[PDB]
Amino acid sequence: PTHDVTTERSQRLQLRFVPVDREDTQYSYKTRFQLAVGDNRVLDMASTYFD
């Protein structure tokens, strides 16, 4: 299908979110991410692994 399958408007396939803040105890390492899902595109959390 050659129509309405690709945006052709310069958007990434992979995005890396750095944590907005991170705090560590001596048992846990809590990290907070602020991920923003564009304005048109959508994603499923089958992606979004932690690196």
Binding site: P1, T2, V5, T6, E8, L13
Partner: peptide, 16 residues
Amino acid sequence: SSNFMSMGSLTDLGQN
């Protein structure tokens, strides 16, 4: 292909 997928032998942008 535009999104590197395979949705047809005649690829998306090859027809384009």
